[PDB]
């Protein structure tokens, strides 16, 4: 008869990314759009209500207007693909999909959102061109809190200061900023590592001293 298949019960998603969680169901040659109902939901928030070949917007929860969308073209392949744009921490939880086509069935999907320190912004300035002292800076946004380990091109630890605040563009993301002020010359390579826990993630940017 009718069964709903989940290719993967768990989706691990990175922050600020797209996501396409998929629910499958049997289809025969063509589709009967009239007899199909697709419904997505998470924590009893209505996300998708697809009836009679068109999504029912009036029911869709407000916090998903313009970020949730079902892909019609996939339905002809027996795939109810829910797509969310710019994934946030608030999108983590348990998602339910309920499909009605002839018979019916529902399935659950879990979503966990990484908040990694992928994007690292670096700035190199010249404190005193006489002593050739520079000011190296690294900053990134992630969760949970992280520390910065300044290592040379010779894999040796240098000391810096780490200021750790909360994000403004987003809610609880920690903004970690570290600064190096070391006398150095042109073409010298340095590294700033972003070590955070839960789980152990190391992310390192490379800063090369320019000339003049």
């Amino acid at each position: 008869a009718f069964t709903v298949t989940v290719p993967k019960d768990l989706y691990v998603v990175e922050y600020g990314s797209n996501m396409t969680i998929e629910c499958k169901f049997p289809v025969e040659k063509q589709l009967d759009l009239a007899a199909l109902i697709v419904y997505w939901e998470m924590e009893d928030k209505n996300i998708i209500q697809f009836v009679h070949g068109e999504e029912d917007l009036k029911v869709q929860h407000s916090s998903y207007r313009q970020r949730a969308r079902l892909l019609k073209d996939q339905l002809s392949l027996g795939n109810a693909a829910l797509q969310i744009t710019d994934v946030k921490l608030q999108d983590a939880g348990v998602y339910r999909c309920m499909i009605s086509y002839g018979g019916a069935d529902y399935k659950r999907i879990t979503v966990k959102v990484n908040a990694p320190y992928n994007k690292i912004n670096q700035r190199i300035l010249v404190v005193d061109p006489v002593t050739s002292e520079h000011e190296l800076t690294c900053q990134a946004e992630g969760y949970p809190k992280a520390e910065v380990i300044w290592t040379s091109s010779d894999h040796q630890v240098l000391s810096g200061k780490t200021t750790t605040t909360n994000s403004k563009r987003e809610e609880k993301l920690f903004n970690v900023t570290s600064t190096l002020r070391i006398n150095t010359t042109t073409n010298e390579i340095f590294y700033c590592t972003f070590r955070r826990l839960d789980p152990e993630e190391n992310h390192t940017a490379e800063l090369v001293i320019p000339e003049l």
């Binding site: 939901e41 009836v51 309920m98 009605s100 529902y106």
Partner: protein, 77 residues
């Protein structure tokens, strides 16, 4: 006088034509699907009840007008 009654009477029929169109979305699902998911059912009846109570309020204020106009043409004649 008689055209004023005629303008309200075919405005109450329109609204009774609007009341029937409010349970319409559900009947067009029972026509097409054979198993209605509970959350999709649970929400539709709430919209179908949000309208019907609202449309039944309107009929009270229209069926009251005709009685007023009927009373007016009893004081006159």
């Amino acid at each position: 006088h008689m055209s004023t009654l005629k303008e309200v009477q075919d405005n109450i029929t329109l609204h009774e034509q609007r009341l029937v169109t409010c349970r319409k979305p559900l009947k067009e699902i029972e026509r097409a699907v054979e198993f209605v998911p509970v959350p999709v059912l649970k929400n539709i009846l709430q919209r179908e009840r949000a309208c019907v109570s609202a449309l039944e309020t309107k009929l009270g204020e229209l069926k009251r007008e005709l009685a007023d106009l009927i009373a007016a043409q009893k004081l006159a004649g």
